[PDB]
């Protein structure tokens, strides 16, 4: 039901399995635990919020998805890697 995503700085993010399958890369992985040696906390947290935001508002007026310009490049790289 839930999967555990681990960041490079050792944070664990417990997300619903169905939400995490928004990522094509993660969907290719799947135990209940995926390790990311290259994605830091402040990026992986946003990635997780994206999963939920997408599942909820896909086929919904859609509110903005907030991204600080300071995290955007790292987020871009992460999202590319994650295929989402």
């Amino acid at each position: 039901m839930y999967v555990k995503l681990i960041s490079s700085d050792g944070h664990e993010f417990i997300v619903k399995r169905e939400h995490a399958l928004t990522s094509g890369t993660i969907k290719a992985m799947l135990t209940n635990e995926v390790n990311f040696r290259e994605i830091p906390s402040h990026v992986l947290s946003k990635v997780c919020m994206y999963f939920t935001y997408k599942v909820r508002y896909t086929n919904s007026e859609i509110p903005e998805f907030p991204i600080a310009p300071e995290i955007a490049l790292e987020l871009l790289m992460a999202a590319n890697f994650l295929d989402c």
Partner: peptide
């Protein structure tokens, strides 16, 4: 209504 891919959203955030 369709949610943009995170790659697109992240790039749009670099444009701003």
């Amino acid at each position: 209504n369709k949610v943009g891919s995170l790659q697109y959203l992240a790039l749009a955030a670099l444009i701003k």
